[PDB]
Design an enzyme around this catalytic site. Structure first.
Site, PDB file in Angstrom:
ATOM      1  N   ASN A 136       0.814  -1.214   0.000  1.00 38.11           N
ATOM      2  CA  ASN A 136       0.000   0.000   0.000  1.00 38.11           C
ATOM      3  C   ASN A 136       0.843   1.258   0.000  1.00 38.11           C
ATOM      4  O   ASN A 136       0.300   2.317   0.244  1.00 38.11           O
ATOM      5  CB  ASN A 136      -0.941   0.018   1.224  1.00 38.11           C
ATOM      6  CG  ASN A 136      -2.068  -0.963   1.104  1.00 38.11           C
ATOM      7  OD1 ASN A 136      -2.527  -1.284   0.000  1.00 38.11           O
ATOM      8  ND2 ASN A 136      -2.606  -1.379   2.232  1.00 38.11           N
ATOM      9  N   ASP A 152      -5.423   2.840  -0.118  1.00 34.16           N
ATOM     10  CA  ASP A 152      -6.547   2.260   0.636  1.00 34.16           C
ATOM     11  C   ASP A 152      -6.768   2.853   2.047  1.00 34.16           C
ATOM     12  O   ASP A 152      -7.503   2.253   2.829  1.00 34.16           O
ATOM     13  CB  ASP A 152      -6.393   0.730   0.767  1.00 34.16           C
ATOM     14  CG  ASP A 152      -6.684  -0.022  -0.511  1.00 34.16           C
ATOM     15  OD1 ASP A 152      -7.516   0.462  -1.311  1.00 34.16           O
ATOM     16  OD2 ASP A 152      -6.111  -1.120  -0.695  1.00 34.16           O
ATOM     17  N   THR A 170       0.463  -9.889   5.390  1.00 31.81           N
ATOM     18  CA  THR A 170      -0.300  -8.930   6.198  1.00 31.81           C
ATOM     19  C   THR A 170      -0.012  -9.073   7.684  1.00 31.81           C
ATOM     20  O   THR A 170      -0.036  -8.060   8.377  1.00 31.81           O
ATOM     21  CB  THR A 170      -1.807  -9.059   5.963  1.00 31.81           C
ATOM     22  OG1 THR A 170      -2.250 -10.346   6.379  1.00 31.81           O
ATOM     23  CG2 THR A 170      -2.189  -8.821   4.506  1.00 31.81           C
TER      24      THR A 170
HETATM   25  N1  LIG Z   1      -4.548  -1.923  -3.027  1.00 27.84           N
HETATM   26  C1  LIG Z   1      -4.645  -1.105  -4.081  1.00 27.84           C
HETATM   27  N2  LIG Z   1      -5.697  -0.365  -4.330  1.00 27.84           N
HETATM   28  C2  LIG Z   1      -5.464   0.502  -5.380  1.00 27.84           C
HETATM   29  C3  LIG Z   1      -6.530   1.480  -5.687  1.00 27.84           C
HETATM   30  C4  LIG Z   1      -6.861   1.853  -6.993  1.00 27.84           C
HETATM   31  C5  LIG Z   1      -7.946   2.686  -7.229  1.00 27.84           C
HETATM   32  C6  LIG Z   1      -8.723   3.145  -6.175  1.00 27.84           C
HETATM   33  C7  LIG Z   1      -8.387   2.767  -4.890  1.00 27.84           C
HETATM   34 CL1  LIG Z   1      -9.383   3.276  -3.559  1.00 27.84          CL
HETATM   35  C8  LIG Z   1      -7.298   1.962  -4.632  1.00 27.84           C
HETATM   36  C9  LIG Z   1      -4.218   0.404  -5.955  1.00 27.84           C
HETATM   37  C10 LIG Z   1      -3.536   1.179  -6.998  1.00 27.84           C
HETATM   38  C11 LIG Z   1      -3.652   2.567  -7.122  1.00 27.84           C
HETATM   39  C12 LIG Z   1      -2.966   3.190  -8.117  1.00 27.84           C
HETATM   40  C13 LIG Z   1      -2.155   2.430  -8.983  1.00 27.84           C
HETATM   41  N3  LIG Z   1      -1.493   3.043 -10.022  1.00 27.84           N
HETATM   42  C14 LIG Z   1      -0.749   2.275 -10.814  1.00 27.84           C
HETATM   43  C15 LIG Z   1      -0.589   0.898 -10.658  1.00 27.84           C
HETATM   44  C16 LIG Z   1      -1.251   0.272  -9.642  1.00 27.84           C
HETATM   45  C17 LIG Z   1      -2.063   1.035  -8.779  1.00 27.84           C
HETATM   46  N4  LIG Z   1      -2.771   0.418  -7.774  1.00 27.84           N
HETATM   47  S1  LIG Z   1      -3.290  -0.844  -5.149  1.00 27.84           S
END
Ligand SMILES: Nc1nc(-c2cccc(Cl)c2)c(-c2ccc3ncccc3n2)s1
Length: 432
Positions: A136, A152, A170
């Site tokens: 994260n 998140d 985790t």
């Molecule tokens: N645990 C994860 N949750 C997200 C996420 C994505 C969209 C909305 C929300 Cl609330 C969370 C991720 C994320 C965010 C940007 C990223 N940009 C480039 C590559 C991977 C990515 N992954 S990883």
């Protein structure tokens, strides 16, 4: 009222997140790129009602910090939730560190100052993470010295996470009080102390052969700086870790007081920490790959039999490009993937399904092979039975179960497996 499909179109899979997959999407009008997390309501249970979620999401959309991910929109339909946010192309923090030649206590403090900056801001707005871990922590850009974005922050208060494919990595970071049920924002300081401990040693403070053994150590809450790596680390870093890894949350330092600590304001090379963090990251990623591989084999086995029954009921003439494409929509973007599949597979529906899925099996094998090769840092071509115990330990496969499966693949193995053997062991562990 607002529909997701009426605004965004999928481009490519960005990877996996907690509670669902992350797709790279593009706005149909402005062309803006976005990372969209798709959360299936059948696979994820809501801890609160729909009123509490809309209000937290509304607040989260209004918050702005350079070390927190930007949430733009939120959509929901019968079977899914869509969290639309900003794209961060630099990858995960620990993947950047393993590629580095040198890593110092100043690089570690610079990282933790950013993580603590994001947290403090979020605690002033009464948002708790609970699941703060290295996955994260995404980097804004390709470069090494780039801004870290916490992902998140606020999701855990509204979504419930059991599947071992998920939940890997985790237990190391979870605060002891989260395990017993009574926790507040101080749990996020504990997780940052654990990450800080790994950045300065390459090893988690609470470790074990499996998930439950790690949680037993966390719950007892005892750890030590009694390893050869800690001799080259200052007492001011040891003092901050002690304050952040204080068992009773009321006695534990706040995220704000951690930024104002002597160490963050004051701040050689930690070579043994980079070698250990490489091994830690390698082990984590191979165990994950092994679980994704076994997952993709059952998914493909299920999809092949479910697609065959659909294409057999569609067959009236005792094959057809329009019918082959029609079949894929029944089990469910899906038409464009079918148009690209039928053109490539051709370049009988029984011979089609085998090639269309053997292409998908080759793609699944090559992702696992990449993580095996990357874990094999000395390029020996093999991993010892000891390394297998660690790997199958973090992926929660029982000792007698993988050792039985190993003797079935190769009876005359000498405590080592090559890639093909490893692949063969995983196939047997998922009924194949
Ligand atoms: N645990 C994860 N949750 C997200 C996420 C994505 C969209 C909305 C929300 Cl609330 C969370 C991720 C994320 C965010 C940007 C990223 N940009 C480039 C590559 C991977 C990515 N992954 S990883």
């Amino acid at each position: 009222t607002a529909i997701f499909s009426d605004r965004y179109k999928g481009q490519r899979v960005l990877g996996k997140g907690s509670f669902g997959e992350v797709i790279l999407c593009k706005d149909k009008i402005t062309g803006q790129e976005c990372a969209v997390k798709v959360i299936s309501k059948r696979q994820v249970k809501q801890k609160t009602d729909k009123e509490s979620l809309l209000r937290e999401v509304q607040l989260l959309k209004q918050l702005d910090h350079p070390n927190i991910m930007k949430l733009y929109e939120f959509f929901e339909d019968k079977g899914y939730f869509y969290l639309v946010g900003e794209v961060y192309t630099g990858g995960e923090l620990f993947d950047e560190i393993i590629s580095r030649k040198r890593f110092s206590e100043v690089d570690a403090a610079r990282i933790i100052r950013q993580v603590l900056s994001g947290i403090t801001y979020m605690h002033k707005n009464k948002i708790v993470h609970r699941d703060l871990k290295p996955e994260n922590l995404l980097l804004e850009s390709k470069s090494k010295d780039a801004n870290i974005r916490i992902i998140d922050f606020g999701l855990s208060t509204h979504f419930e996470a059991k599947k071992m494919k998920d939940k890997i990595g985790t237990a190391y970071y979870i605060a002891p009080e989260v395990l017993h049920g009574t926790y507040d924002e101080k749990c996020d300081v504990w997780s940052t102390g654990v990450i800080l401990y790994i950045l300065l040693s390459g090893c988690p403070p609470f470790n074990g052969a499996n998930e439950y053994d790690i949680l037993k150590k966390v719950e007892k809450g005892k750890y030590t700086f009694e390893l050869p790596q800690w001799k080259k680390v200052s007492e001011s870093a040891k003092d901050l870790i002690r304050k952040m890894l204080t068992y009773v949350p009321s006695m534990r330092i706040s995220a704000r007081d951690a930024l104002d600590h002597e160490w963050i304001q004051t701040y050689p090379s930690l070579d043994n920490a980079i070698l250990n963090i490489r091994q830690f990251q390698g082990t984590q990623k191979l165990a994950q790959a092994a679980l994704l591989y076994m997952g993709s084999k059952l998914t493909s086995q299920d999809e092949t039999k479910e697609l065959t029954a659909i294409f057999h009921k569609m067959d009236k003439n005792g094959l057809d490009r329009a019918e082959l494409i029609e079949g894929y929509k029944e089990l469910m973007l899906d038409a464009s993937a079918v148009e690209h599949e039928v053109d490539q597979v051709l370049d009988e529906y029984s011979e089609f399904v085998t090639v269309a899925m053997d292409r998908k099996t080759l793609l699944s094998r090559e992702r696992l092979e990449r993580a095996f090769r990357m874990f094999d840092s000395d390029n020996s071509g093999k991993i010892s039975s000891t390394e297998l115990a660690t790997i199958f330990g973090v992926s929660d496969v029982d000792s007698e179960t993988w050792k039985s499966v190993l003797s079935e693949v190769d009876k005359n193995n000498d405590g080592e497996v090559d890639f093909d053997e490893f692949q063969q062991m995983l196939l047997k562990l998922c009924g194949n």
